[PDB]
Enzyme design. Structure first.
Site, PDB file in Angstrom:
ATOM      1  N   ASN A  43       0.793  -1.223   0.000  1.00 30.69           N
ATOM      2  CA  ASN A  43       0.000   0.000   0.000  1.00 30.69           C
ATOM      3  C   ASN A  43       0.828   1.277   0.000  1.00 30.69           C
ATOM      4  OD1 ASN A  43      -2.277  -1.728   0.318  1.00 30.69           O
ATOM      5  ND2 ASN A  43      -2.072  -1.623   2.552  1.00 30.69           N
TER       6      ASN A  43
ATOM      7  N   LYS B 247       8.652 -15.775 -35.103  1.00 30.49           N
ATOM      8  CA  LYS B 247       7.877 -14.640 -35.576  1.00 30.49           C
ATOM      9  C   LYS B 247       7.085 -15.044 -36.811  1.00 30.49           C
ATOM     10  CE  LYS B 247       9.833 -12.080 -32.445  1.00 30.49           C
ATOM     11  NZ  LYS B 247       9.092 -11.697 -31.215  1.00 30.49           N
TER      12      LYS B 247
ATOM     13  N   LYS C  29       4.814 -12.947 -33.909  1.00 28.55           N
ATOM     14  CA  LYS C  29       4.441 -13.280 -32.537  1.00 28.55           C
ATOM     15  C   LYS C  29       3.195 -14.142 -32.517  1.00 28.55           C
ATOM     16  CE  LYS C  29       4.611  -9.826 -29.608  1.00 28.55           C
ATOM     17  NZ  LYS C  29       5.854 -10.138 -28.848  1.00 28.55           N
TER      18      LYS C  29
ATOM     19  N   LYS D  34      11.742 -20.340 -29.044  1.00 32.07           N
ATOM     20  CA  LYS D  34      10.760 -20.136 -27.971  1.00 32.07           C
ATOM     21  C   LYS D  34       9.426 -19.575 -28.427  1.00 32.07           C
ATOM     22  CE  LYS D  34      11.058 -16.593 -25.169  1.00 32.07           C
ATOM     23  NZ  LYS D  34       9.954 -15.853 -25.697  1.00 32.07           N
TER      24      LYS D  34
ATOM     25  N   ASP E 245       6.541 -16.970 -28.320  1.00 35.07           N
ATOM     26  CA  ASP E 245       6.429 -15.594 -27.864  1.00 35.07           C
ATOM     27  C   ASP E 245       5.634 -15.541 -26.567  1.00 35.07           C
ATOM     28  OD1 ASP E 245       7.349 -12.943 -28.782  1.00 35.07           O
ATOM     29  OD2 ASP E 245       6.926 -13.761 -30.775  1.00 35.07           O
ATOM     30  N   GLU E 246       5.946 -14.543 -25.738  1.00 32.07           N
ATOM     31  CA  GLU E 246       5.324 -14.455 -24.423  1.00 32.07           C
ATOM     32  C   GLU E 246       3.803 -14.455 -24.515  1.00 32.07           C
ATOM     33  OE1 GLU E 246       6.969 -11.542 -25.824  1.00 32.07           O
ATOM     34  OE2 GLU E 246       4.881 -11.324 -26.496  1.00 32.07           O
TER      35      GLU E 246
ATOM     36  N   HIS F 298       9.931 -15.711 -18.547  1.00 31.09           N
ATOM     37  CA  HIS F 298       9.827 -14.480 -19.320  1.00 31.09           C
ATOM     38  C   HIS F 298       9.246 -13.389 -18.431  1.00 31.09           C
ATOM     39  CE1 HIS F 298       8.259 -11.533 -22.167  1.00 31.09           C
ATOM     40  NE2 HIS F 298       9.020 -12.069 -23.104  1.00 31.09           N
ATOM     41  N   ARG F 299       9.951 -12.262 -18.341  1.00 30.16           N
ATOM     42  CA  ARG F 299       9.597 -11.171 -17.432  1.00 30.16           C
ATOM     43  C   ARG F 299       8.581 -10.214 -18.029  1.00 30.16           C
ATOM     44  NH1 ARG F 299      14.779  -7.072 -17.591  1.00 30.16           N
ATOM     45  NH2 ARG F 299      14.884  -6.874 -19.875  1.00 30.16           N
TER      46      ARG F 299
ATOM     47  N   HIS G 166      14.961 -13.302 -18.376  1.00 27.77           N
ATOM     48  CA  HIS G 166      15.444 -12.247 -19.251  1.00 27.77           C
ATOM     49  C   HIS G 166      16.034 -11.113 -18.425  1.00 27.77           C
ATOM     50  CE1 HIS G 166      13.476 -13.355 -23.268  1.00 27.77           C
ATOM     51  NE2 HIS G 166      13.281 -14.378 -22.455  1.00 27.77           N
TER      52      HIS G 166
ATOM     53  N   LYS H 133      16.740  -3.266 -28.607  1.00 28.93           N
ATOM     54  CA  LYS H 133      15.655  -2.307 -28.776  1.00 28.93           C
ATOM     55  C   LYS H 133      15.035  -1.882 -27.451  1.00 28.93           C
ATOM     56  CE  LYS H 133      12.157  -5.922 -29.407  1.00 28.93           C
ATOM     57  NZ  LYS H 133      11.418  -6.775 -30.382  1.00 28.93           N
TER      58      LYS H 133
HETATM   59  O1  CAP Z   1       8.828  -9.867 -27.867  1.00 28.68           O
HETATM   60  C1  CAP Z   1       9.992  -9.634 -28.272  1.00 28.68           C
HETATM   61  O2  CAP Z   1      10.382  -8.556 -28.761  1.00 28.68           O
HETATM   62  C2  CAP Z   1      10.990 -10.798 -28.140  1.00 28.68           C
HETATM   63  O3  CAP Z   1      10.376 -11.943 -28.635  1.00 28.68           O
HETATM   64  C3  CAP Z   1      12.226 -10.430 -28.935  1.00 28.68           C
HETATM   65  O4  CAP Z   1      11.970 -10.678 -30.266  1.00 28.68           O
HETATM   66  P1  CAP Z   1      13.308 -10.184 -31.289  1.00 28.68           P
HETATM   67  O5  CAP Z   1      14.453 -10.853 -30.532  1.00 28.68           O
HETATM   68  O6  CAP Z   1      12.991 -10.719 -32.674  1.00 28.68           O
HETATM   69  O7  CAP Z   1      13.307  -8.669 -31.195  1.00 28.68           O
HETATM   70  C4  CAP Z   1      11.331 -10.984 -26.639  1.00 28.68           C
HETATM   71  O8  CAP Z   1      10.171 -11.397 -25.943  1.00 28.68           O
HETATM   72  C5  CAP Z   1      11.930  -9.696 -26.007  1.00 28.68           C
HETATM   73  O9  CAP Z   1      13.301  -9.561 -26.216  1.00 28.68           O
HETATM   74  C6  CAP Z   1      11.653  -9.705 -24.502  1.00 28.68           C
HETATM   75  O10 CAP Z   1      12.085  -8.491 -24.013  1.00 28.68           O
HETATM   76  P2  CAP Z   1      13.103  -8.698 -22.583  1.00 28.68           P
HETATM   77  O11 CAP Z   1      14.294  -9.358 -23.259  1.00 28.68           O
HETATM   78  O12 CAP Z   1      13.336  -7.296 -22.057  1.00 28.68           O
HETATM   79  O13 CAP Z   1      12.292  -9.617 -21.687  1.00 28.68           O
HETATM   80  O1  CAP Z   2      -3.373  -1.179   5.165  1.00 29.08           O
HETATM   81  C1  CAP Z   2      -4.152  -0.223   5.390  1.00 29.08           C
HETATM   82  O2  CAP Z   2      -3.815   0.966   5.556  1.00 29.08           O
HETATM   83  C2  CAP Z   2      -5.632  -0.588   5.460  1.00 29.08           C
HETATM   84  O3  CAP Z   2      -5.749  -1.700   6.304  1.00 29.08           O
HETATM   85  C3  CAP Z   2      -6.368   0.641   6.012  1.00 29.08           C
HETATM   86  O4  CAP Z   2      -5.940   0.837   7.315  1.00 29.08           O
HETATM   87  P1  CAP Z   2      -6.900   2.011   8.191  1.00 29.08           P
HETATM   88  O5  CAP Z   2      -8.281   1.425   7.926  1.00 29.08           O
HETATM   89  O6  CAP Z   2      -6.403   1.966   9.622  1.00 29.08           O
HETATM   90  O7  CAP Z   2      -6.648   3.332   7.495  1.00 29.08           O
HETATM   91  C4  CAP Z   2      -6.100  -0.944   4.021  1.00 29.08           C
HETATM   92  O8  CAP Z   2      -5.403  -2.079   3.564  1.00 29.08           O
HETATM   93  C5  CAP Z   2      -5.903   0.242   3.045  1.00 29.08           C
HETATM   94  O9  CAP Z   2      -6.888   1.214   3.147  1.00 29.08           O
HETATM   95  C6  CAP Z   2      -5.871  -0.282   1.606  1.00 29.08           C
HETATM   96  O10 CAP Z   2      -5.792   0.844   0.807  1.00 29.08           O
HETATM   97  P2  CAP Z   2      -6.666   0.671  -0.715  1.00 29.08           P
HETATM   98  O11 CAP Z   2      -8.046   0.322  -0.176  1.00 29.08           O
HETATM   99  O12 CAP Z   2      -6.555   2.021  -1.387  1.00 29.08           O
HETATM  100  O13 CAP Z   2      -5.944  -0.473  -1.399  1.00 29.08           O
HETATM  101 MG    MG Z   3       8.438 -12.207 -27.123  1.00 33.64          MG
HETATM  102 MG    MG Z   4      -4.567  -3.167   4.812  1.00 32.28          MG
END
Ligand code: CAP
Ligand code: CAP
Ligand code: MG
Ligand code: MG
Ligand code: CAP
Ligand code: MG
Lengths: 450, 449, 449
Positions: free
Chosen positions: B104, B156, B158, B182, B184-185, B275-276, B308, B315
């Site tokens: 939060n 490709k 994708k 691989k 694609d994600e 894959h991130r 990754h 790019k």
């Molecule tokens: O979606 C794409 O672009 C890719 O398939 C790359 O294709 P190309 O290699 O043909 O560009 C990968 O998922 C990215 O590199 C992931 O990004 P990261 O590495 O930051 O996870």
């Molecule tokens: O963690 C906290 O602060 C709470 O327990 C509130 O405490 P109080 O009730 O004592 O203020 C809730 O999780 C938040 O309100 C969530 O925010 P949202 O609803 O915007 O995700």
């Molecule tokens: Mg990809």
């Molecule tokens: Mg809470």
């Protein structure tokens, strides 16, 4: 096949394309890298989120990219609209939407900042999702509470209380007038408070408080855990004890395990409170991330029974007009576009059930006039610190918040202006409720900027 | 019980606290609301990510908050260090860490912006996590590939390719020199290419390129799905087909389901590529969100065989110094603190297995010198458009990339300076590799800042 | 609330209603009881298949019938068009479609005869169905057969052969040219031929013919049985025997058990052949029943890999123009309406896989020119009697048919008109094929109108 790098805008920017009722639409706010035209920035988003990559490949001719590619069909200043065919997305998988729409395109050098402002989920895709398992109308029948906001509150301290002392606070809260209580999002199962223990102490307190007041009660037990199996185990135990509710952190757990819990919740007859923990990590800043109205749609599609929407007036940031929109996106059958509230597209919900908005965070009795005005009856108001922080304890604080809500509701039904006469409405109630007087006196100078 | 609103600093700011070896440390970069002093802002993140709320509560006296409360024990400009006792966290649950540390506090009115830069996972906590199921050494043994980076490439387009045509690309890719390919994600199971069809077609191609090249091959079959149960169903089928890998988007699927898949992959003998996807949604901007190094620590704690890490020169955005530090955090037993690379704490990994860095995105042959220089041998280089975009197709482009890598490793082993003689080295291999020559001519003017 | 019987037309006949892209549309042909005006009769069908009943009820006011009632929005002579809102139906249930559309509206005293001609399945509802498990293209890949109609044939006698003698016939059919064979619709498990024996004998005949010819072969083992669990049990066994196919009578077994088998077929890698036994009980007469094209739509929605479509020129009734339209419904991505082929609506298939048409019943070599011209390459031709009835047995009859199809396909691809020169093309082949000559003589006077 002509091999080489060609700008994205030659194949993924079609400013004449007419969106189809089956297409999935997005509204991106783009901040190009200086020297990269808006068109090339929007086209690179449309390309690297659908079917394209950084150079021409031979395999592009093994298929019909005219049918599958995403297209930026409109640009209004720094806002790009992109239309995605229906056949690109796996049915009933929010995990698949995100892997395309927000998978890689937020980290490209050419696009220095990117925010997904809104998404139009088409009806033909919406019919592949189950929606909430319970909904507002059913849940109100299970709780036998009608005609007012519902009262709740997170137990404090967040962490550190034993299972016993924990349910003692729950008990004081429920018997005092609160409809429900909940585990804090970060209370799962810890050395100081193991989940099996807390689940057993709390339900005793829940049963005891129901039996004394005669009003049905509930405690949102947090099944969030480090694995899907563990969450399903804890949800199984909650039902075996008779709990009407369980609680999950749908973002920290993740949409895959969230769907798993939601399916088991229905099978067990449990209602599913949903906590938006982590949302501020990417829905706060206007120049980058994902607005919350997009996360709320995803939440309704998967199926949460409630979800936190913000308080506006409380301790956490929340724009009013935007919140008013998100509340309709969660509750209504058809939400029309409204630039005044940030709603870029019309949203037909195709019959799915509505989700309870929950207003939590640093609120107290003085906020109830605003809170009733913003949300209406179909919403939960959570008073954690505003309950246990009462000079005389949780039961005294619960009573004060219940009388305040019921007093403001009664004033609205009688036709009064609860925003002008809010103080007068609260002061009238205080002259017969010392708990409320003491509550008002304590927090009379506690305000947050709106 | 003294009811009322008190400043978070009165109890959650302790600039005398000595952090323990068992504490979980966080380095937060804070941008307070104007008028809110730094010490108070830091205390608000400490209070609301551990034990406290906006006002005093009687139930505070029912427990010993001196033992459980998080404390900001140090502030350096706009960087706040906060210590969390060990008992605050659930054993082996990344989901729990995220529910406290980043739950939060990123949405409070008093803290206009907040970025989690680094986290010190204490050893006593790390011992509750299994780590990767396979690791570098075992993977290389399963593949029988040693002494160079491992070649890969995303298929490709994708999306859009039928199962049949998709696996034909795969076949040409693995046949031509690639070790892996691989999904694609965003390729899960869609009308144009259902996961059951793709798995069957692809593994035929895998077994067919492995038989023709004599070299062991693999394909990263994406089991990402809308539910855990479905991801485990698809991981089961992949294992029944004799696949050496599965792939999962651990951030879009989520950390709870990710833990479910990682556990099943080990039971099935699968190696787990991760894959991130979605990471740049909260690790891009330097003023708000979560730096990726933290996401890389969690990844290694749950157990991903690779992840990754970006390319630097590709790019997608990615900083060289930082990326070097994220490679060590993924592969080394111990990493000392290093302001130059953004490492705010020493990190002992307590014997967890290493993770394979993967560098993918917008890279081609001209980047192979820099890459080998940045990552070394224990890393994957994925060529997607850089393989299928070749003038003669995937087969030829895969030979150009495999040849570029082995020519830069050979030179590096011979003592050359693969950065100073980067162009020369490649031109020598191109003499014997027509494929490589075409690849260098085509992308000779394609660079990224 | 005004209690009492009101005409159906008051609330269920709205000729001003514009149908939506989400509504489900029906084309009924109605025969009102003498004296019942067409509007009233049409309104009855709409009412009693959606929301209404024979009299007003107080409960009508507990809902918004304006949102859920069906509406006959257009009448063209004796044809009533009725639109059904999307909410009325259960996602993914053909059973629920039939319970509404054809549940009680066919037996009303007010409507003497009622025939469903066509149905518009909206895309928003089609996306709740999986469609075929395999599809035409993936099926051709598994067989490695392309560019011609595929041959088949029902083992005869329908009933009475031992499991041994049965598989002996199968072997003589597959070895002699036919690509497949099949159990008869009414051959499940009987005292003379139990299903486990037949499954073991036949697969031996399949494997033995695949090794003597070098072509992939298959047999359509009938899993149809008295309960869903028995069908599934027999599917599991077929898959453990390595069969590529199973067979199911999807109409006699029913749509509920059909969906169960279809889901298990994909889970087991089984291609699903679907026999339409019992269809002629309610798609024959033009004044009453359900036209087959409606059944074909449901079939492809649930998921069959083949379905019979009739021959036109064989021993079972079938109209040429209508059949051509049914084929398009089974194979194409989008089929525009065409009054010439009885297609009342445009049918968008929203990406579902296609279904193999199957032509069976009383056909012999002389029909191959017509069959090719009617169906094209994507189709199975089944020669039961036309194979075993050869003067020299099954082996010789299979060759005579395989040659007749390949000789007519070669002529078409060379440019010849296979209808005008149908007799010539076959006689030219009979020169290098005695088996074809013998069959042409035998059945040279067997014709069906
Ligand atoms: O979606 C794409 O672009 C890719 O398939 C790359 O294709 P190309 O290699 O043909 O560009 C990968 O998922 C990215 O590199 C992931 O990004 P990261 O590495 O930051 O996870
Ligand atoms: O963690 C906290 O602060 C709470 O327990 C509130 O405490 P109080 O009730 O004592 O203020 C809730 O999780 C938040 O309100 C969530 O925010 P949202 O609803 O915007 O995700
Ligand atoms: Mg990809
Ligand atoms: Mg809470
Ligand atoms: O039972 C029979 O008559 C068949 O085995 C044909 O035998 P022959 O090949 O010996 O004619 C087929 O099941 C029918 O053609 C089915 O009818 P439809 O094709 O209309 O479903
Ligand atoms: Mg038959």
């Amino acid at each position: 096949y002509e091999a080489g790098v060609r700008p994205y805008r030659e194949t993924y920017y079609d400013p004449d394309y007419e969106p189809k009722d089956t297409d999935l639409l997005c509204a991106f706010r783009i901040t190009p890298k200086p020297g990269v035209p808006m068109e090339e920035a929007a086209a690179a988003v449309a390309a690297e989120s659908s079917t394209g990559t950084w150079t021409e490949v031979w395999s592009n001719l093994l298929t019909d990219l005219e049918r599958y590619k995403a297209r930026c069909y409109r640009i209004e200043g720094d806002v790009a609209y992109i239309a995605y065919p229906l056949d690109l997305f796996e049915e009933g998988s929010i995990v698949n939407i995100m892997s395309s729409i927000v998978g890689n395109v937020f980290g490209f050098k050419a696009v220095q900042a990117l925010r997904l402002e809104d998404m139009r989920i088409p009806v033909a895709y919406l019919k592949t999702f189950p929606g909430p398992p319970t909904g507002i109308q059913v849940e109100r029948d299970r709780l036998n509470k009608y005609g007012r906001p519902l009262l709740g509150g997170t137990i404090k301290p967040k962490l550190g209380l034993s299972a016993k002392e924990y349910a003692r606070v729950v008990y004081e809260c429920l018997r005092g007038g609160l409809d429900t209580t909940k585990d804090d999002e970060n209370l799962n199962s810890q050395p100081f408070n193991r989940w099996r223990d807390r689940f057993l102490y709390v339900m005793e307190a829940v049963r005891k408080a129901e039996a004394e007041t005669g009003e049905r009660k509930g405690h949102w037990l947090n099944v969030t855990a480090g694995s899907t199996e563990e969450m399903l185990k804890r949800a199984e135990f909650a039902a075996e004890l008779g709990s009407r509710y369980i609680m999950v952190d749908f973002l920290t757990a993740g949409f895959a395990a969230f769907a798993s819990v939601r399916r088991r919740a229905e099978e067990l007859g449990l209602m599913l409170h949903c906590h938006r923990a982590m949302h501020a990590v990417f829905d706060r800043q206007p120049n980058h991330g994902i607005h919350f109205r997009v996360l709320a749609k995803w939440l309704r599609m998967v199926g949460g029974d409630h979800v936190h929407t913000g308080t506006v007036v409380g301790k956490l940031e929340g724009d009013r007009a935007e919140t008013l929109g998100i509340a309709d996106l969660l509750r209504e059958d058809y939400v029309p576009a409204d630039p005044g509230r940030g709603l870029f597209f019309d949203q037909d919900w195709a019959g799915l059930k509505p989700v309870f908005p929950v207003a939590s965070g640093g609120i107290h009795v003085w906020h109830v006039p605003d809170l009733v005005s913003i949300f209406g009856d179909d919403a939960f108001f959570l008073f954690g610190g505003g309950t246990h922080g009462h000079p005389r304890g949780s039961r005294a604080g619960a009573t004060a918040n219940r009388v305040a809500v019921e007093a403001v509701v009664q004033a609205r039904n009688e036709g009064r202006d609860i925003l002008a006469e809010g103080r007068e409405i609260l002061e009238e109630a205080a002259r017969s409720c010392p708990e409320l007087r003491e509550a008002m006196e304590l927090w009379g100078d506690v305000k947050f900027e709106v």
